[PDB]
Design a binder for this molecule. Sequence first.
Ligand SMILES: CNc1nc(Cl)nc2c1ncn2Cc1ccc(C(=O)O)cc1
Length: 164
Amino acid sequence: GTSKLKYVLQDARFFLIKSNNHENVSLAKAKGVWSTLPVNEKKLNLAFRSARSVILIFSVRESGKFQGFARLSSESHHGGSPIHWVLPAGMSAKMLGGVFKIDWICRRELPFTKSAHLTNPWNEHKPVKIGRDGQEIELECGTQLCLLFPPDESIDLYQVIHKM
Ligand SMILES: CNc1nc(Cl)nc2c1ncn2Cc1ccc(C(=O)O)cc1
């Protein structure tokens, strides 16, 4: 069902994550971690204290799809382990240094063609697929976007609800 999902999404904040490559999203799904650039890291750390749930919605650049969504379970932390990210051309390894722990809510894909009816007030009402890494998605648009994803029956939201 969708009832526990709706409960997790209640009064949540939503951020669009854009990854340059599929490998880091795969690593994030395997290890329950994410790292971003310092500007976005500060925003997510602020949001984590501000909201009952902070939801990251992932899209790999050029894929035409979202790859899933996850909830922050921690602020960023250093020195736990050097996650073997694949660095973009130019991107150093100290720029992706802060590691957030995340709990996946859905590891299924959603093509952009299915979200074409959703616009983001915080990005000039452009379609929600449009946005830079870290773009905040307003509550109503982000809730409907998450509800569009196919159900991920491999995930049990009971433990996610307890961390709230
Ligand atoms: C493990 N975390 C990550 N992995 C990958 Cl592959 N891309 C990420 C990412 N977090 C953000 N992005 C996209 C991005 C946006 C701007 C620049 C730049 O201004 O150079 C570089 C990358």
